[PDB]
């Protein structure tokens, strides 16, 4: 009934963090936790498709998007399933994650279990950019850290 | 206390050449590492932070790399402007600690505006050296003047 998941972010760079996921019944997914070693500001935070860590964060592949939609923010209708928008780092280089989302899930067709969370170099523009790239990646830039999403106790 | 250690302690290099300072921490600092540059006697300046990210207004010839305990700053094509002391700082653990610095100088090579800029560059250096002498002699006056007010 109540599903829990967890994700340990790792990269070559300074970013570290643990992400927690809880989802009771078919309620929303509560994402929570802490990311360190970020620059102050906003950082794109997305579920990528594959939990493949063989080639760092590059092997995670593109945003988790089974509905073949375009990139957007978390509140948009036109968005990828994985698009959870931005986490915000303070002057301490730390981001407290607190996100509630309904499109992602810990079971069924929209399960993120066995896929990768990625925190990005720059802000996610939520698909409101002045180029092709914006409706793909949101110009969030390179992938600072990632982790496969596992089932938690 | 983390001991961050730089090498070389000083270094000489020709223009256009490719230079590489290193910084080695006594433990993993997970890329919480900043590079500061301090030209002649002016204020320190931020080149690089989080090991590899250039700061604002930093020439792109500067680059930073490394992880774990071992990091390096690399100037790809050395201009004459770049003669300076370079410092690494780690902020992974408190207290923040700093390398002892790498001093970097030229060894040599081989326009009225250019001759007169070189001439004025002596002025701050000279005025600085004079002010050292003034404060030196002000500290010698200081006791005597205190005795006079007694």
């Amino acid at each position, epitope marked *: 009934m109540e599903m829990k998941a967890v994700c340990v972010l790792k990269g070559q760079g*300074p970013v570290e963090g643990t992400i927690h996921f809880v989802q009771k019944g078919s309620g929303p997914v509560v994402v929570s936790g802490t990311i360190t*070693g970020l*620059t*102050k500001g906003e950082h794109g935070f997305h579920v990528h498709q594959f939990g493949d860590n063989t080639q760092g964060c590059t092997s995670a592949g593109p945003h988790f998007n089974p509905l073949s939609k375009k990139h957007g923010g978390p509140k948009d209708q036109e968005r990828h399933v994985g698009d959870l928008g931005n986490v915000t780092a303070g*002057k*301490d*280089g730390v981001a407290i994650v607190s996100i509630e989302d309904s499109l992602i899930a810990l079971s069924g067709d929209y399960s993120i279990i066995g896929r990768t969370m990625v925190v990005h170099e720059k802000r996610d523009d939520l698909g409101k950019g002045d180029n092709e790239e914006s409706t793909q990646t949101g110009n969030a830039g390179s992938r600072l850290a990632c982790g496969v999403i596992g089932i938690a106790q | 206390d983390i001991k961050m250690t730089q090498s070389p302690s000083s270094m000489y290099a020709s223009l256009g050449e490719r230079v590489t300072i290193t910084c080695k921490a006594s433990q993993d600092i997970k890329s*919480y590492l*900043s590079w*500061y540059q*301090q030209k002649p006697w002016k*204020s*320190p*300046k*931020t080149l690089i*932070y*989080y090991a590899t990210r250039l*700061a*604002d207004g930093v020439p792109s010839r500067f680059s930073g790399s490394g992880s774990g305990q071992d990091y390096s700053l690399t100037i790809s094509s050395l201009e004459s402007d770049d003669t300076a*002391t370079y*410092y690494c*700082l780690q*902020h992974r653990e*408190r*207290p*923040l*600690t*700093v*390398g*002892a*610095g790498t001093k970097l100088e030229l060894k040599g090579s081989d326009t009225v505006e250019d001759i007169q800029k070189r001439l004025l560059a002596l002025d701050p250096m000279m005025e600085q050296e004079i*002010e050292e002498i003034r*404060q030196k002699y*002000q*500290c*010698k006056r*200081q*006791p005597i003047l*205190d005795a006079i007010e007694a």
Partner: nanobody
Amino acid sequence: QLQQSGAELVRPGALVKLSCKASGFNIKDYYMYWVKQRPEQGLEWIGWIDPENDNTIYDPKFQGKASISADTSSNTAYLQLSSLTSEDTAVYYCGGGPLYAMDYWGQGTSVTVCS
């Protein structure tokens, strides 16, 4: 811009209080650092203050000799050195930045201590 106080010259045992007036940014959004550089020598980091809550970290080497404070209203940071000796003859830089870079190492205040 970070405007630091002017050159000091004091007797052994004197207190001195340096200042750092920031214009262009709210110091509440940063940390204000202090850095010492004894002549012909390298940088020592003294400490920083988070003006948002007046929390201060120091290098133990300085905790007790040096005292860092901020006035959020006048948007100014302060460094206070007490029981000054020749050891303390140095240039003190104030800077501001996140925890991961003093993005404003600037100006600098020379302090000279007699004997």
